[PDB]
C-alpha cells in the first residue's frame, strides 16, 4: 500500500495581510513538495532529492494550481464568515486533506478528500467518491452547490486517474528510498525511580515508514494500562523514533519483554533488560 496525500491550510490574519496559504505534499510518510504563499517568490518546491529530476514545466504547473487554490481558500474563509455570522476581526482556519491510496494491484484502493473550518469537519467526499457528507448545516449549502455542479464526479476522475498515475510516477522517481523499509534498531534502558520501582524504556529508532507497534508484555498479557506511549516523532532525516515506558518493581524486570514489529522486520522483535 502506497499513498499520495496533500495537506492544505489557509490562515486568516486580520490587519496583517492576505490569509497565508500553505500546501505540503506527501508520498507515504515522506514530505516531497511544499508551497508557501508567504515565501518571497511563491513556488511549489521539491523537499526531497528524488524530485529534483522533474522539469520546470512540472513545477510551474503546480505553482499555478497552488496560486489559484490559495485564492479560493481565501474566498472560502470569507464565505465562512457569512455562514457563521463571524466578524472580520478574528483569525480563522480552513484546511483540506485529500489523496489516493493504492493497493497491491497498483490501482486505487481509497480516495479521500475532506475539508475543515477552524479545526472541525466541514465537508468530505464519501468513500464511494459519488457523494458528500456535510458536517453541519452551513456545509449543507456547500453540498447543494457541489452536487449541482457535479463536483463529486470530476473529483472522482482526479483521484482515480491523475492522483494514482502521479503517485506511481513519484514512487518510480524515488524508488531507491521509498520502497525499502528501514527496520527499527531497538533497545531497552533502565531508570530507577526508587528502591522499589524502576522505569524500563523501550526504544525504537531510525525506522521507516511511520507505522510501528511497541507493546510491553508481562508473560502473555500486555500492559497497556500503566505504560507511557509517546507519539511517534520524526528523526529529522526522514526516519522516525518512538518509545514505550513501563514502571515495574525492582527484581521483576526480567519478567517483562518489549515486543517491537515494523514492516521492515521479518519477524517481531523481542527485547529485555538483562
Amino acid at each position: 500500500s502506497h499513498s499520495l496525500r496533500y495537506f492544505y491550510t489557509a490562515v486568516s490574519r486580520p490587519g496583517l495581510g492576505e490569509p497565508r496559504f500553505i500546501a505540503v505534499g506527501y508520498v507515504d510518510d515522506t514530505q516531497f513538495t511544499r508551497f508557501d504563499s508567504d515565501a518571497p517568490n511563491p513556488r511549489d518546491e521539491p523537499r526531497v532529492p528524488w524530485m529534483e529530476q522533474e522539469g520546470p514545466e512540472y513545477w510551474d504547473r503546480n505553482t499555478r494550481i497552488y496560486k489559484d487554490t490559495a485564492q479560493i481558500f481565501r474566498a472560502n474563509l470569507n464565505t465562512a464568515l457569512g455562514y457563521y455570522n463571524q466578524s472580520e476581526a478574528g483569525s480563522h482556519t480552513f484546511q483540506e486533506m485529500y489523496g489516493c491510496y493504492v493497493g497491491p494491484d497498483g490501482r486505487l484502493l481509497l480516495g479521500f478528500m475532506q475539508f475543515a473550518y477552524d479545526g472541525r469537519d466541514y465537508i468530505a467526499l464519501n468513500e464511494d467518491l459519488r457523494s458528500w457528507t456535510a458536517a453541519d448545516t452551513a456545509a449543507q449549502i456547500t453540498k447543494r452547490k457541489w452536487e449541482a455542479a457535479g463536483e463529486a464526479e470530476r473529483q472522482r476522475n482526479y483521484l482515480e486517474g491523475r492522483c494514482v498515475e502521479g503517485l506511481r510516477r513519484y514512487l518510480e522517481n524515488g524508488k531507491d528510498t521509498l520502497l525499502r523499509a528501514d527496520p527499527p534498531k531497538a533497545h531497552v534502558t533502565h531508570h530507577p525511580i526508587s528502591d522499589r520501582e524502576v522505569t524500563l524504556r523501550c526504544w525504537a529508532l531510525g525506522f521507516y515508514p511511520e507505522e510501528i507497534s511497541l507493546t510491553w508484555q508481562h508473560e502473555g498479557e500486555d500492559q497497556t494500562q500503566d505504560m507511557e506511549l509517546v507519539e511517534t516523532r520524526p528523526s529529522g532525516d526522514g526516519t522516525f523514533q518512538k518509545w514505550a515506558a513501563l514502571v515495574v518493581p525492582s527484581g521483576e524486570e526480567q519478567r517483562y519483554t518489549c515486543r517491537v514489529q515494523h514492516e521492515g522486520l521479518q519477524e517481531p522483535l523481542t527485547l529485555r533488560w538483562e
Binding site: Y6, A23, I65, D68, T69, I72, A80, L159, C163
Partner: peptide, 9 residues
C-alpha cells in the same frame, strides 16, 4: 500533481 483545488464552499 495536485488537484485543481477550485472548490468554493
Amino acid at each position: 500533481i495536485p488537484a485543481y483545488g477550485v472548490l468554493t464552499i
